[PDB]
Write a protein that binds this ligand. Structure first.
Ligand SMILES: Cc1cnc(Nc2ccc(C(=O)NC3CCN(C)CC3)c(F)c2)nc1Nc1ccc(Cl)c(NS(=O)(=O)C(C)(C)C)c1
Length: 111
């Protein structure tokens, strides 16, 4: 049951990586490369960076005890984007499209 919700989480993350969503999901695939992007204030603003590849590693390492812990890291990834960037920034629009994909499926988690 907890195992079953974690399988749902693995399926959700797999969809977030699917080519269908790549046009807006790709900025979230990997840790933000603050040095390559020139984001010299990023570590002053974001205390706990998170990205889809790290979430994938933690799922395989069994670091999430249940779906709520998984969901928290996904929401942290999005919240980090909304916190760091101006609300009209293009990457915020991309976060919103990816968060729609996540939330709609996360809401179908089995009881
Ligand atoms: C998860 C995440 C959260 N916040 C931000 N913020 C941010 C905010 C701004 C700049 C930016 O200013 N980049 C300059 C613009 C052109 N230059 C030649 C150097 C890089 C910036 F890169 C990132 N990014 C994230 N990921 C991310 C990963 C890779 C890339 Cl390439 C980008 N670039 S982006 O945001 O400009 C775009 C996706 C709309 C094209 C973003």
């Amino acid at each position: 049951k907890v195992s079953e919700q974690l399988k749902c989480c693995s399926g959700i993350l797999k969809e977030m990586f699917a080519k269908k969503h790549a046009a807006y999901a790709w900025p979230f695939y990997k840790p933000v490369d603050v040095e390559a992007l020139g984001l010299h204030d990023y570590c002053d603003i974001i205390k706990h960076p998170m990205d889809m590849s790290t979430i994938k590693s933690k799922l395989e390492a069994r670091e999430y005890r249940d779906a709520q812990e998984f969901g928290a890291d996904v929401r942290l990834m999005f919240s980090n984007c909304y916190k760091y960037n101006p609300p009209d920034h293009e990457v915020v629009a991309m976060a919103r499209k990816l968060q729609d994909v996540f939330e709609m499926r996360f809401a179908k988690m089995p009881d």
